[PDB]
Symmetry: D3
Subunit: 304 residues, 6 copies
Amino acid sequence: PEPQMVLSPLTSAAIFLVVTIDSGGEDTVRDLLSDVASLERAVGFRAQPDGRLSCVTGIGSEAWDRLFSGARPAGLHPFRELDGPVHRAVATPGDLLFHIRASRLDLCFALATEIMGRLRGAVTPQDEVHGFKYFDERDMLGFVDGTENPTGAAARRAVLVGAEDPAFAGGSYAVVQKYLHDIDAWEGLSVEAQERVIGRRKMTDVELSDDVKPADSHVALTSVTGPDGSDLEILRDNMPFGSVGREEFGTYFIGYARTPEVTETMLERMFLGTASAPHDRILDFSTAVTGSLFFTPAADFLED
Amino acid sequence: PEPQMVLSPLTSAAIFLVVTIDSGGEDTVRDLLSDVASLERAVGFRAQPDGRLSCVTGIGSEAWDRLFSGARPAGLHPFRELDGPVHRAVATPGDLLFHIRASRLDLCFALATEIMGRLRGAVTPQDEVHGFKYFDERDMLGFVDGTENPTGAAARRAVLVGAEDPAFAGGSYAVVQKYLHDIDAWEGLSVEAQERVIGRRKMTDVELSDDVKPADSHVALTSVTGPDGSDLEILRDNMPFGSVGREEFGTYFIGYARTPEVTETMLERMFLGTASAPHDRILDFSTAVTGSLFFTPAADFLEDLS
Amino acid sequence: EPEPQMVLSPLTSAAIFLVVTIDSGGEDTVRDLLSDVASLERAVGFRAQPDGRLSCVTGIGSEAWDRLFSGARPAGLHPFRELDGPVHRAVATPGDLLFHIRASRLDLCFALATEIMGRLRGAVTPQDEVHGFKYFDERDMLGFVDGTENPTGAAARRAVLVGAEDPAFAGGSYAVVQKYLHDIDAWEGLSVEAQERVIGRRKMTDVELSDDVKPADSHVALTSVTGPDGSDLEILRDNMPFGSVGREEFGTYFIGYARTPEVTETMLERMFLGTASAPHDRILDFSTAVTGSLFFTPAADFLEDL
Amino acid sequence: PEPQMVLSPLTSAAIFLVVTIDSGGEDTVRDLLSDVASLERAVGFRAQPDGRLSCVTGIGSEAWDRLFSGARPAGLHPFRELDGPVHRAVATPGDLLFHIRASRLDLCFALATEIMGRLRGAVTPQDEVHGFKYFDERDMLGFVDGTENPTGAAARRAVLVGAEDPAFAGGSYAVVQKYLHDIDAWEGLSVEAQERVIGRRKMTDVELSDDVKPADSHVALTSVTGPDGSDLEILRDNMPFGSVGREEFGTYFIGYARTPEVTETMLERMFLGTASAPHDRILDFSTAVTGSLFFTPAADFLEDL
Amino acid sequence: EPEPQMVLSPLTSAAIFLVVTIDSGGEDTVRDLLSDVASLERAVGFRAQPDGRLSCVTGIGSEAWDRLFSGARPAGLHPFRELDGPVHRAVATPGDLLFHIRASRLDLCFALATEIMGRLRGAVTPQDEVHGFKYFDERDMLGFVDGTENPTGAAARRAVLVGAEDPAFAGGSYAVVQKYLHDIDAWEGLSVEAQERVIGRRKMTDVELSDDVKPADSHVALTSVTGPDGSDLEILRDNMPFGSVGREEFGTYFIGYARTPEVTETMLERMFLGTASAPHDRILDFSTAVTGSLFFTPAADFLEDL
Amino acid sequence: EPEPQMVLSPLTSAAIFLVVTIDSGGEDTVRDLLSDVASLERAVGFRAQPDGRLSCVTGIGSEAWDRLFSGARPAGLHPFRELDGPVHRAVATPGDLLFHIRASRLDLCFALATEIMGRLRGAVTPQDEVHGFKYFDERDMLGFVDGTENPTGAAARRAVLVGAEDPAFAGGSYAVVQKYLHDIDAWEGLSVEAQERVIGRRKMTDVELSDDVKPADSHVALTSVTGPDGSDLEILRDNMPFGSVGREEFGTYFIGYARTPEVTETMLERMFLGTASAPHDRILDFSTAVTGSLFFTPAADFLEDL
Ligand code: HEM
Ligand code: HEM
Ligand code: HEM
Ligand code: HEM
Ligand code: HEM
């Protein structure tokens, strides 16, 4: 089975589009799903090889039941709200996700325009974010963002559904959350204090040693080991976004995994805490304003 | 006199930031203006040579009077509203313009962030546009955009103030207008009908011959000759922008010239018409929602302040 | 695991197509060159890596095969079959060897062509030599994007490379070439909308026409073929413009690779002879074939071990 | 005055087009000349900044008098044939030259197509060459080609007409010659012998010292000093071309200069020789099959027609 | 199943070779660094992706292996074997750990080397450090293209990676290093044709000399080796120039990877000890080896699991 | 118009600094090489254009000038003046000729250095050779962006090139070089904010500290100098990192160009001897100078006419 382009090369621009399916819009959606790979080639082919345009399409739990009969993917459910002692991870509506990436924002925009052109009248937009990465892979907090992502075979094993759910092999599960940052409070920390929040050195991106790394740092809480002592991994492609005039400085989080269990365990540690950590210190500078979960099928499932 | 980077190499990303100066905000603004070139180097130097980051700072007519107590540039006045039989060019508030360009949007954003950080509490944002050019220099209507801009010495002569206003030599005048397009109506035209609106072939960007080019085409109405029969030219760096969710498809128009009279003559022909043309046909698919005029001083004028 | 030639190449902007016949007595000289052609490709190309992207694919015709080699023949190798349609004809022309040379620059193609022809001088007769160049946005001489629906990855290897069905020749492929000359004056008298109906895709944006509007005699409709089992039958194409402005020659050099010639031949029959719903491919009202040849391109190790 | 793009950045592709003007063709030609700069922007602008497309347009001596009334450039005359003891520099017909350059051949071809489209029925093609430079600036003989071209202000001084002919300031003079090489004979020389023909080391492109450089080497014979002891310089943009099937291996020579007398003095030394040298040894491997001279006006002269 | 180190790297234009010995008592510190070296590589390199192309290959010598690890040894691991020929000598020099660091820029190599040696200060003693750079046309200090006949693709993986013959160490490789200094004055007194007879390929065009004219004591002839079964035995080389113009040091740093050391050592025996028809490799009359060491480069997951 | 050497070069990522002394009797050989150095630069660099950006700036010291030439001397040419401060010392070390070689790749630098030293063999003795590399974000070995406040354009030409104040030497410049080694262990024991107070700019973003927080003994405060007439006195710097990981040598090679040595010397005095409000430049508590030399870099045509 041929996957979507979940494992993409590095891209410096993205558009995230989240929409809901209106009553009566199902047929128009199904038609667009069967064409979206052909649209990606149409927009992207003439700008190769620099363009690096791809679209990953996802489907939510409620929408799945409206669109398709027969089997459901084993791990597909609505995003679970987390109500922690201090911080909350909200659930927001979303039936379809389009994760569009390229080396330039204009290519993303052209593909987004063709997709939304086909869906006008059948869907209602819930969110639209235009992301850009800083030239040294830094995020809005000034830290390098992406470093410990898996690559090669390890990435395929962490991300792609396999024999455990064979009708949906080559699919993946995506979790999205839009975060807004309090940059004034963040910039009042010393660099060393910022390093203790994240768990890595700021300039050089070397991980803090085990003897200095706090238990409530982002890296400590999002490190999870499985039954057998192995690392449970996800693939992230976080993007900055914002608006200088409205004082909006953001990170759009997207995490792909072979089962939602990995990602959800990470989120529970961050928002609910553990015995050794009240919560992830990154959340004292970061508020989640969306939250949704999608299944991204194999490409050939959509092509039918 | 050293000009600002009005004549920039080609860039694929931009931020246009227009603000008003709040009462009492003058001193904070003057401070920032004296530092803006140093901020441009701080953000941009470490991303050389590919970053191509620049900022052009402009000052409106009313803002000028509040900030500076001596001589005014000869051509600086508020944007003049044009109230045509069908189409209108609105005047909207704007005291400062920052026209920020680079090869990547993140560099523009970082500079904009440092600028606005210094001005917080002294200004009110009026408009913010993040622009991106299509990879083949096309605009949102699908036409190549920039082709007949002047280059080299011809560009310097068309854009930079000289002997005619010697205390402001090395300056320029910028007009900005944000346009929203009706793309559904545009896409209902045949290609040949689109070509008759613009005045050039769509795929190849060859100009239509004098015998076929209509009098109400964009190229015909924005072609202007001077007293002496020479072409009057401006330098444009138009940028697409928009939001697919809200169905907003735009062109952010910016035109630089040595005197505003050139730009204003073009706008009068577009909105009020001529003997042979009621108005520029591009306006049947394009609505102006902002309009402002700014003087962009020489770099050394900004540096030598308090 | 047999190693194919570079049939699946990255995108290249230049090519040389060389077709020759083997003179009486030339067989031994040809066999020697075939055993060295991969080493010649590395010699010319290695020092221009990684930007040069030089490759050579070598093909052998049906009659030449019998003169060069004893033993097994590839199952699908035969001479190109003439198609004599009601209006349009696909000619067969002689060719014993093909050299399909590709790079990012024409000079690298030329240097390899020079070394190859240097070794063969006196043993072969040139039949055709074309120097091809792709336009910067992947467009062909008709102004349309060309290559968009080619298969990639695993699907390309499945469509192109001989496998278990002919195991002695696994890793090989079959190439069909046809040189086409266009009537550009007649083409350019069509509106863009009428050109789109000929091809089956939008010209500027390269989006396929919807199933309800795509004509039955459009190029895309006629070259879309489904198998017994309802799967798409695919080929890999690397069409190249060529020409001479002085002689008014504006061409497309067609080359198509497939695992069996049956797929390509079925496409040709539909284009030239038509179907129940279509007299012929409308692209042929603007395009005349002046060559036609079929070659087997062996696995690289077959050539090395000879 | 704004010159044409005679001083171009380095380009790896070119098309050279030479045509004659048919009976009655003058009006069509003048129309095209007034549009050629706008055609160059139309084809080139959307491929910037990598495309690097330019067109330099030249006009021959006889064609000048047919197209324009009034003043003539002072140095414009027909190419002068040189009939040497062994080698000959031929003159061939040519009224218009289009020297088209870009980073890629397809851009050159698109501009050539629009130009020839406008001239169909008014001109007759005499020569069409598609040139390509090797990736390390080498020519068909395997030597680096372009090294001692002038640059910056020295190039402007060597190439552009100035005060000496003020109505035509910003123009230049181009000489073209297509050469075919005997590659079999060249490749039978040792590298060291080829170096003695050229006057520079082959791999490293270092000039041979004055005490080793033979007097009949290409570099020695094309090194010319003026009245004042100053070097006389031209700007060259030689391009390989050919056809493997026809065994055609060529260099298309083009040289620009402020007056044709510099280039013509170089040609006399190559073909007729000096006291110490019978002829340029490069000509024992290189035969000229075309030769023409053109004036390339300032851009604004063409625009105003 | 096993993940190899980046032995099969893309082409890189810079490198650092660092060879150290492990001081008495330094074993625990070294083991800790080995378990972190892939994490350090990502830390330095991720922010320069995708153009940085930073990798480190870590090797372990025969004596050091016994000090660091208990259990199985790789089958082919032994100390480099000194070769004492009649004229030329291949010396053995001490070396416990190799770090073969490659990128598109020297600063990335340098930053990673700085982090590695930072962790190891006090536990190791440096024996050699070389900063290599490629000439722009892949030439070495002798003026010849260097790398041309390296295997690529599947053939490279087969030639380089340990497989089923030693399954506990599958995905590993064996590296031989030798630093060579050249006598450039003597080399440059040869004619080009005499240089070509030393190497066995043409200098400017890199075409191999024909079998009839290639000397038996040329570098290419002596390093071409066939197996019992008729097949070519191949290695993967990534030779780098280095030197110092003030001290008249012009060098080639030799590094050769192979699935078993026997292939590389057979090549070295032919070069230094000769054959019946060749006393020695003529390249050694202009090249002196001043180091020689052999290392096993384990699979990446072997290092991670420490 | 006197033609300067390439003192104002585009940004380069590699350099070689070569300092030599002229042996007794070596004068004639040196004069011959000086008359050829621009020809050597074109020979090596032409075939790598336009990306190579190879240039060589040649300097001559005070004592060497008097050995090579007769007549008038440049007005400001003297040997480097040793500074003996209370804590820190700026040493003077020997040097007759400087070759400042820059390019986008080290191999071009190396090839030109090789041809230069080839011509001078036997007539000079090497004193210093440094191969420099810039970090990818223009950072130096202390982790700060280095070169941000250099002047550019016309302001750089005014700061650097000799003019009417010394008209026989117009178009020349004066270069001061100092090799510095850093104590990185001590530097890395500071917090980032303490590092920022040493330099006078923020580390990650390279924004200058406000005048109310910037210490008087910071690097930027002590190297900011105004003239009698209120103007900034500027120099043009092209500092390069260098080092050796095995020897724990981490360096900055300082080179500063100016129209008169007095500007550079005033800055050095402030750094090493202090002012009323500052004992010394705090950068020197982590940085030791181990060389110091001063050279005049003549106009290009002065070298040619030898
Ligand atoms: C405000 C939102 C976020 C920001 C600004 C952010 C930023 C970062 C940074 C800077 C790192 C260190 C470098 C690296 O990418 O390895 C990191 C690591 C990581 N983050 Fe986040 N992150 C955010 C949210 C999340 C969320 C919501 C999850 C999981 C649900 C997550 C999972 C991870 C993981 C798994 C790593 C790798 C940890 C390791 O194993 O070393 N992050 N993040
Ligand atoms: C919706 C807003 C606009 C769009 C999309 C637009 C687009 C274009 C296009 C596609 C061209 C032809 C190619 C070229 O030379 O750039 C053009 C030319 C031009 N436009 Fe606009 N334009 C707009 C508004 C304006 C305005 C407001 C002015 C002046 C106030 C203006 C002045 C010009 C000029 C001077 C030319 C050059 C005509 C010539 O000399 O050939 N445009 N524009
Ligand atoms: C004058 C000669 C030709 C021209 C200019 C040409 C041009 C084109 C163009 C523009 C397309 C659309 C974009 C794309 O998918 O590449 C196309 C598609 C295609 N052409 Fe051609 N074509 C030529 C001859 C041929 C011939 C001779 C064949 C087969 C024997 C062929 C087979 C195809 C196929 C299979 C497709 C893809 C159809 C699909 O599945 O969507 N073409 N060609
Ligand atoms: C027959 C084909 C020709 C070839 C292949 C050729 C090749 C070369 C080569 C390799 C160089 C040395 C590197 C360089 O400085 O460019 C050179 C230099 C030069 N050639 Fe040619 N050339 C040819 C014809 C001509 C002609 C016809 C002229 C003059 C009318 C000419 C004038 C020169 C000049 C002036 C130089 C620079 C000399 C100096 O160092 O000052 N060449 N040529
Ligand atoms: C001074 C040290 C060396 C230099 C400058 C050098 C240089 C070269 C050059 C120029 C070639 C021809 C082009 C190529 O295929 O890469 C070559 C090929 C080769 N070298 Fe070396 N080499 C050196 C040492 C060694 C050593 C020590 C070995 C083995 C232990 C070796 C093994 C090979 C092999 C296997 C080939 C490919 C031969 C073939 O099958 O065509 N080299 N080398």
